[PDB]
Symmetry: D2
Subunit: 236 residues, 4 copies
């Protein structure tokens, strides 16, 4: 069959096949809280990666992997608004959180540049877009395809629903270098979609680590970044 395919219908406290970085952890209710949710709400950054690296492309053959992923998340804000967002990403194998990372950078970037050495490809669900602190962002909550920079190469208005569960399907078809993000809220039928061209071979190393990351930059505008389930499959 395919090179790899795993599925988590629920998460268990201290799941040993998930690497936790930052404030990420799984509650006793079986939900992955990439961002810390506590009594006195605090600033936070967290990342959760699947324990084993994945071969996204082969230097011997030239083959590039096609992958698909599905997951359901909830972002619940106390007030009508929150910060900072959630992201699904592919990074160099067993990558660590960059030194001096902002919550608005989702623990994925050291700065706001477009360094080729970053080697990150992420799909952000950006809830904060204030010009004062996030000048790169557009003027609304968005879904964005990030390639080596927090300044998305393509964005789309994200009709975020507070506290509602969202179903996301992300597919990457290697032969056409097409990355599609399918988001929908079964609650009221709201749907957002976005597609972009990305050549994984040109951006990522042979072996990568996949996972989620997120952050809360200001404790006063707190919101959760909980992923409920996660399906993933790749194939060379």
């Amino acid at each position: 069959s395919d090179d790899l395919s795993f599925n988590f219908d629920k998460f268990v406290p201290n799941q040993k096949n998930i690497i936790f970085q930052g404030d990420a952890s799984v509650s006793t209710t079986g939900v992955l809280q990439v961002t810390k949710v506590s009594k006195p709400t605090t600033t936070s950054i967290g990342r959760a990666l699947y324990a084993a690296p994945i071969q996204i492309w082969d230097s011997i053959t030239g083959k590039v992997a096609s992958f698909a992923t599905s997951f359901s998340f909830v972002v619940k804000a106390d007030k009508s608004d929150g910060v900072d967002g959630l992201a699904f990403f592919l990074a160099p194998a067993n990558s660590q959180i960059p030194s001096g990372s902002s919550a608005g950078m989702f623990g994925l970037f050291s700065s706001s540049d477009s360094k080729s050495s970053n080697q990150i490809i992420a799909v952000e669900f950006d809830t904060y877009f204030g010009k004062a602190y996030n000048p790169w962002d557009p003027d609304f909550k968005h879904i964005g395809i990030d390639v080596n920079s927090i300044k998305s190469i393509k964005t789309v208005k994200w009709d975020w629903r507070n506290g509602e569960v969202a179903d996301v399907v992300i597919t990457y078809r290697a032969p056409t270098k097409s990355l599609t993000v399918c988001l929908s809220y079964p609650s009221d039928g709201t749907s957002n979609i976005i597609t972009a061209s990305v050549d994984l071979k040109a951006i990522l190393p042979e072996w990568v680590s996949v996972g989620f990351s997120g952050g809360v930059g200001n404790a006063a505008e707190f919101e959760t970044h909980d992923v409920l389930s996660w399906y993933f499959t790749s194939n060379l």
Copy 2:
């Protein structure tokens, strides 16, 4: 594993696990032409079903199946416009083309009513919306969720691209009765999405047949309705 899952990366002439109805057939290039394509263009209606029925729900247990499907199609018009459209549908097991079916009805309906006995659920990619002959349609090319009637319960502007390949992902999550249609053109990054609530148990019989259908109502405004690949999986 799952109750069923099949994949066709290409089609072969006279594929024996696909039932051909009407003018449907697969060319020597390995593409399923649900709608007949010929030098002297003609009116046409065709349907192609997977040879084996699928249990979409169980009366014993009450369980409803969740399914997902993926396929890539091309609709190439000679002029700047064409008719009539393509559709992915679920119909009663080993269903036959209704007597007196219009091309604008995609060979799925005998009339324009909303008869409960129809027992059809389809996702249409409607290219013709003229009021004279298709009064039920909206004022633009659309993607529509059809439930027992050609008058879609929900539609969305379909930014059709002539001759370009479109990638479609359709998921139905039984627990939330959520049907999502994800369409994208890797060519220029155009994407369309739509979601609706549908209770399969209330509309379809226990055993159904899945497939594609399409039609060309007027030979003068000819266009192709070719599906290139097809992945499908369901599970109770």
Copy 3:
């Protein structure tokens, strides 16, 4: 992914994706009784409703497949007839005219006709010389290729009324067909492997399923399959 893969954890009465031939049917308990249980002589076959492309003439590719199923053969006395079989036959094949129960509804005769185009794995319970002269001197598992006279057999340590788990794999690149049988009840296991070139025996499109028979109503036994997993890939 793979060209095809289906799984039945239980069967439903009148399952519409299974073609029933002969006396085959599924009881209300959700078990596929390929052989009629009531008492009487019987022959039955059950095929998955859709044909499977076992090899491609364009590319030359041959499919590799694997199947898993659990069955029970319960005899009233200490012995029964006739057996059960998993087979691959020409697409939407029908039961041959004048078929014996000892032929499992797969063969018109006892020859080795190239035109038969059948490949089956038999779980033969009857081996009497009077009627089944081709069989060995014991209950066996046999790989059948175009003939009821197996090309290779193995003593089958059958357990009356006990559930058996079978795993059959065919690895196209080595033309290796392996049959893995085991009884979780007491740990009894039987295994057999043979070389078979599907391309040389079967047509491009085939139908897979089970068949079985009861040749003598006095030595009755059931031929019930409980579950069935199957996957193939070109």
Copy 4:
């Protein structure tokens, strides 16, 4: 789908999703040599584990995982005989090679006892059975089910073929606690099978690591322990 399922049709030098212990490594031909092969030949012990732990049972629900694995290996001896053997095993998550491990213990055991704390379940393909050094073994090359001890709870004559490729299928059906080992040589049709009852819940921790191990106890009776491919899937 299932909790996990991966497949390696070939191995790449320094595969990052395989943890190498001891002398294990993958040659440039793409084969996993769990046991070191070099000229001159030397004593050796090696283990290769899939990089991510697997949840074999759940303490919350009580569920036990069913799994299946398939792999092809070759054991090529210089003379007519070799030592010591190969083994597929399940051990505590991210387990390390026990201190003072013999090659005849396959790098899985510190001693020859039956300590409950070992928490190992392995399927050995034992090529050496000499009484002088391996008194626990039977009087022939065998396949054995090991549970917390190198003294197999059940064995079977293994009709080993020098240099020939063997196909192995191992299935564990949780509901019946049935572990079956299916071995066959496509070369001449030789087949060996063995089944035993094992309760994973009673022997292994919730999270385990799966892989292969093997050893060469005496360089003078050298043989290879190469695995060519590996498929694995588990499900709770």
